[PDB]
Amino acid sequence: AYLTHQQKVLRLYKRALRHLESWCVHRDKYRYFACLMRARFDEHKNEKDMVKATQLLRQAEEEFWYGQHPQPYIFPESPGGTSYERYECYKVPEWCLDDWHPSEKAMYPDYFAKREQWKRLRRESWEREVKQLQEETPPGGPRTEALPPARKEGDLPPLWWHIVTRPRERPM
């Protein structure tokens, strides 16, 4: 939804010292700076009518963007880094398990037996998880990208399969 000062200055403070640690590199310098931006960040947490609260905020973003480290540090496993989407090459969906060859099916029998009961609980709980979801769905479909749980008895939390059966973050 829309962003409010708290959500936004928390966003600000993330990037701000990400530049600062990348600016200073060595811990201790950035350490003294990071904790003093903290005081500099609370040096005005009592402002009057929200217009100034917004206007000073505008001054925060501009000096942030030109104080943004032009080459900032990004952790590789996260978006923008070396390891970002690196293992998506090894990512492979679960439906390739179904078309396994019968001779190869008998070479991994226990793992195919477990997928049989895993897809079994997929089917026997899919229809109940969805019917409950539509009846509890407010009119006009969903009002947000939320998901109802298995709040009742003997049910699975609706729309669980793909996110339960999501490929592991290190498919290797």
Ligand X SMILES: CCCCCCCCCCCCCCCCCC(=O)OC[C@H](COP(=O)(O)OCCN)OC(=O)CCCCCCCCCCCCCCCCC
Interacting residues with ligand EHZ (CB under 6 A): 5-6, 9, 12, 16, 19-20, 37, 41, 44-45, 47, 53, 56-57, 60, 63-64, 67
Nearer residue to ligand X within complex by CB, 67 or 142: 67
In the bound state with ligand EHZ, the residue whose beta carbon lies nearer, of 60 and 74, is: 60
In 98-127, which positions are buried (b, 16+ CB within 10 angstroms) versus exposed (e)?
Answer: eeeeeeeeeeeeeeeeebeeebeebeebee
Task: Sort 47 into a burial class: Cβ within 10 Å, 0-12 / 13-18 / 19+.
Answer: middle
> What sign for the dihedral angle of Cα 113, 119, 124, 128?
positive
Could you say which of 9, 15, 18, 23 contacts ligand X (CB under 6 A)? 23
Phi/psi of residue 142, nearest 5 degrees: -75, 140
Q: Is the Cβ of residue 88 or residue 152 nearer to another protein in the bound state?
A: 88
- Closer residue to ligand X, CB minimum distance, 25 or 89: 25
- What is the contact mask toward another protein in residues 58 to 97, using x (rule: CB under 8 A)? x--xxxxxxxxxxx-xxxxxxxx-xxxxxxxxxxxx-xx-
Which residues are at the interface with ligand X (CB under 6 A)?
Answer: 23, 25, 69
